[PDB]
């Protein structure tokens, strides 16, 4: 299974939402499938970022919250957690 990488500005952001009423049962499942180099179901709506954002990828953990992410090598590297209009 990858290595969890948490950048600083991931964590920040967590501790934002959770703040917030955040609830994370349904990331830790996300990121368990991530860390397992797994396909996310439809509702996850996962996809590849484009133009000066590749090679990064997001998900919608809930229609509001984006989780921006990278496998690279032997890592999962979460960037950010949050809204994509508040994220871009």
Partial sequence: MLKLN??????????????????????????LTLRKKEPLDPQFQDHALKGKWKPFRECHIKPDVSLVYLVKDDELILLRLGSHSELF
């Avoid at 950048?7 to 920040?12: D, E, G, I, R, V």
């Avoid at 934002?16 to 049962?25: P, R, Y």
């Fill in 6 to 31: 948490l950048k600083k500005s991931f964590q920040k952001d967590f501790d934002k939402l959770l703040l917030n009423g955040f609830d994370d049962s349904v990331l830790n499942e996300v990121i």
